[PDB]
Design a protein around this ligand. Structure first.
Ligand SMILES: COc1ccc2c(c1)c(CC(=O)O)c(C)n2C(=O)c1ccc(Cl)cc1
Ligand SMILES: [Ca+2]
Ligand SMILES: [Ca+2]
Ligand SMILES: [Cl-]
Ligand SMILES: [Cl-]
Ligand code: NA
Ligand code: NA
Lengths: 33, 337
C-alpha cells in the first residue's frame, strides 16, 4: 500500500460540509515553533 | 451559499498568499471565515464606497451578487455553522464593544443581534486598560480558553471594538492509536534541518490523490461529523508552486479526483499559533475609505463619527490522536473620525 509520510512542510485546510466553508487554512513549516 | 463558497475560498487563498510574502517560510495559520465574517459585519453599518470596498475586497462582484444577497448569505452561513450537530463542537459569533457615548442605530444593533450572532456590550473606553482586559477575557471565554491575549494594544482614543470568534473541536472518523505514535521522529523544516516531533501512524483507507499537475500529494481525513481535514504535501522544492496554484478551482478539481484506498499514513502530533496585524494588509487589498477621515459608517451610528484604525487576528491549532481543536478571533478597532 502507498506510504504518505507528512514529514516536511505541508498546507492544511479544515472544511465544514453543510456550507462548504474553509474554517481554517495554514502551512506548517516547523511544528515545534 | 455555493457561490459564496468559491468566493470565500478564493479570498482565503489570496490572503494566504499575502501572508507568505509578509512572513516567508514561516508557519501560517488563520480562520478565513472569522476574518470574512467580521468584515461583513462591519460592512452592515457602512454605506456607498466604504461598503462596496469592503465586500469587493472580500471577493464579491456586486453585479453578480448584490449587496443584500451578500448580507443574507453571510447571515445564513453563520446560522448554519452554529446549528448543533452531534460529535462536532463548532461555535462562531461576534461581540460589539461600543463606547458608552456613541449613538448606535437601532437598525444596526437589531441586525447584528438577531441575524448575526452578536452580543452587544456598552463599554467605558475612558478606562482603556480595563476595556482591553475585558475584551481579551471575553474572547478567551468564547474560545474555550484557547485564544488568549487577542488585543495586545488598544489606541487611547478607541471608541468601538468589533470581535469575531470561532472555536472548533472534532474527533477523527478514524482516530490514531497512541501506542503506534513514535515519540520522536524527524520532520524536515528546511533542506538541512530537522526537528523532532511525535509521529502518529495508521494504515487505513483514506481519500487521497497525487496531483500530476501541481506535483503534490493530497490526503483527506474526515472528522466524525460534518467536517474534514485536507493535508497538501508538495514534492520537494515545490511548495511555492503549489501555493501559487491554490484556488477554488483547485479545490473543485480535488473534490472530483480524490479516491479512497489503503494508505500507510504518518501524521505529526503538534500545536501551533499565529498572529497577524491586518490593518495595512486590508488597506492594500482595497479597504481604503473605512480608514479615512471621510469613512461612511452612516448605517452604524447617528453622527457617523467613527473610522476604522486597526485590525488583527490570532489563531491556534492542535492535532493529535483523537482529533483536532482549533480557534481563532478577529479584532477591528475604531476611533473618532
Ligand atoms: C477532496 O477535496 C475536497 C475539497 C473541498 C471540499 C471537499 C473535498 C469536501 C468534502 C466533500 O465534498 O466530499 C468539502 C465539504 N469541501 C469544501 O468545503 C469546499 C470548499 C470550497 C470549495 Cl471552492 C469547494 C469545496
Ligand atoms: Ca470558505
Ligand atoms: Ca483505523
Ligand atoms: Cl469556501
Ligand atoms: Cl471561508
Ligand atoms: Na454617534
Ligand atoms: Na460594560
Amino acid at each position: 500500500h502507498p506510504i504518505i509520510q507528512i514529514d516536511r512542510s505541508f498546507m492544511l485546510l479544515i472544511l465544514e460540509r453543510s456550507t462548504r466553508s474553509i474554517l481554517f487554512l495554514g502551512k506548517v513549516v516547523n511544528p515545534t515553533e | 451559499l455555493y457561490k459564496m463558497s468559491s468566493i470565500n475560498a478564493d479570498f482565503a487563498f489570496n490572503l494566504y498568499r499575502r501572508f507568505t510574502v509578509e512572513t516567508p517560510d514561516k508557519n501560517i495559520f488563520f480562520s478565513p471565515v472569522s476574518i470574512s465574517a467580521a468584515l461583513v459585519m462591519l460592512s452592515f453599518g457602512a454605506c456607498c464606497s466604504t461598503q462596496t470596498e469592503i465586500v469587493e475586497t472580500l471577493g464579491f462582484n456586486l453585479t453578480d451578487t448584490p449587496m443584500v444577497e451578500i448580507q443574507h448569505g453571510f447571515q445564513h452561513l453563520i446560522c448554519s455553522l452554529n446549528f448543533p450537530k452531534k460529535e462536532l463542537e463548532l461555535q462562531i459569533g461576534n461581540a460589539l464593544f461600543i463606547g458608552k457615548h456613541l449613538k448606535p442605530l437601532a437598525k444596526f444593533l437589531n441586525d447584528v443581534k438577531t441575524l448575526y450572532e452578536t452580543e452587544v456590550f456598552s463599554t467605558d473606553f475612558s478606562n482603556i486598560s480595563a476595556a482591553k482586559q475585558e475584551i481579551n477575557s471575553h474572547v478567551e471565554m468564547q474560545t474555550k480558553g484557547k485564544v488568549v491575549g487577542l488585543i495586545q494594544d488598544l489606541k487611547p482614543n478607541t471608541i468601538m471594538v468589533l470581535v469575531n470568534y470561532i472555536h472548533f473541536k472534532a474527533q477523527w472518523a478514524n482516530p490514531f492509536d497512541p501506542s503506534k505514535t513514535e515519540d520522536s521522529s524527524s520532520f524536515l523544516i528546511d533542506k538541512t534541518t530537522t526537528v523532532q516531533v511525535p509521529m502518529m501512524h495508521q494504515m487505513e483507507q483514506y481519500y487521497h490523490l497525487v496531483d500530476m499537475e501541481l506535483n503534490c500529494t493530497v490526503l483527506q481525513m474526515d472528522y466524525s461529523k460534518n467536517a474534514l481535514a485536507l493535508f497538501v504535501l508538495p514534492k520537494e522544492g515545490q511548495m511555492e508552486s503549489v501555493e501559487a496554484a491554490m484556488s477554488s478551482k483547485t479545490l473543485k478539481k480535488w473534490n472530483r479526483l480524490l479516491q479512497k484506498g489503503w494508505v500507510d499514513l504518518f501524521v505529526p502530533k503538534f500545536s501551533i499559533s499565529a498572529t497577524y496585524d491586518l490593518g495595512a494588509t486590508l488597506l492594500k487589498m482595497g479597504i481604503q475609505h473605512a480608514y479615512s477621515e471621510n469613512a461612511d459608517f452612516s448605517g452604524l451610528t447617528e453622527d457617523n463619527g467613527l473610522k476604522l484604525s486597526n485590525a488583527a487576528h490570532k489563531a491556534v491549532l492542535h492535532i493529535g490522536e483523537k482529533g483536532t481543536e482549533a480557534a481563532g478571533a478577529m479584532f477591528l478597532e475604531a476611533i473618532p473620525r
